Amino acid sequence: VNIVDYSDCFEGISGGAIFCNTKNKEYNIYNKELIETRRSPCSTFKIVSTLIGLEKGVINSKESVMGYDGTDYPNKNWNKNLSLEEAFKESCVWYYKKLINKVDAKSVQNILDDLKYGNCDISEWEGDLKNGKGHLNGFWLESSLQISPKEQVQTMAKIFEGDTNFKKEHINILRDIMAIDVNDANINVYGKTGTGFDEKNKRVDAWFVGMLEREGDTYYFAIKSDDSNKEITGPKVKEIAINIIKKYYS
């Protein structure tokens, strides 16, 4: 366990980072206090909800559809019968809400328990209804479910090293749709952003969680901001993560 200083890459934004190589057990941590603090996963939960949907047969492949009903949304890409791959990349809320609401709560509780997914608290299934967004809410979006960045890394490692009961076929679908292009062919990066605002504490929850493969070595990582500036989003924290990867993990 090495404490490290990645502040240069955060460019003034408050946050922390954790990278873990489970082969040679090297855990690199920037802002240990924050890395151990549980927060809403926001859209990073789509990593797990995709696997839940595959395991329960709600969806079956990166092509699978959820039966778009014509509802109007501001994001143009949400207004179509999009595939799993496109819903994941567009972070399409209605698709993932419809997917999870086809799964019984006890099945979800038991999967989160098995994964040790933070507090595993799905008690507020419908999410943070006081924000007015109605059915565009759920337990994973600034609601009852909370997970620390370290726990995110621990969960990703267990999934992608083959240490859960999820089917290998389903893990590979997830890997496929999580892959990102960082304009460096010598590292494979996979991840998912998340964005929320913690109304209680007046701070963002901005995430980028995933893994890095570079010649035999694999690093599981979570980068997290808790800045008070509402302009700090998941996508911005993903840029910070990419800078860290290129600087220190190339």
Ligand X SMILES: *C(=O)N1C[C@H](NOS(=O)(=O)O)CC[C@H]1C(N)=O
Residues that bind ligand X (CB under 6 A): 42-43, 91, 93, 141, 193-196, 233-235
Distance CA 62, CA 172 (A): 10
* Structure-token pair, residue 122: 């799905």
Residue 217 Cβ vs ligand X, minimum distance, rounded to whole Å? 27
Q: Which is nearer to ligand X, 126 or 161 (CB)?
A: 126
Render the burial of 73-102: b for 16+ CB within 10 Å, e for the rest: eeeeebeeebbbbbbbeebbbbbbbbbbee
Please identify the residue of the shown chain whose CB is closest to the bound ligand X: 43
Do 139 and 196 meet the contact criterion of CB atoms below 8 Å apart? no
Q: Which is nearer to ligand X, 67 or 74 (CB)?
A: 74
Residue 162 Cβ vs ligand X, minimum distance, rounded to whole Å? 26
Please provide residue 9's backbone torsions phi and psi, each rounded to the nearest 5 degrees.
Answer: -75, -25
DSSP string covering 57-92: TS--STT----------SSGGGSS---HHHHHHHT-
Residue 113 Cβ vs ligand X, minimum distance, rounded to whole Å? 23
Q: Which is nearer to ligand X, 28 or 117 (CB)?
A: 117
Q: Which is nearer to ligand X, 22 or 197 (CB)?
A: 197
Q: Which is nearer to ligand X, 89 or 175 (CB)?
A: 89
Residue 236 Cβ vs ligand X, minimum distance, rounded to whole Å? 9
Residue 91 Cβ vs ligand X, minimum distance, rounded to whole Å? 3
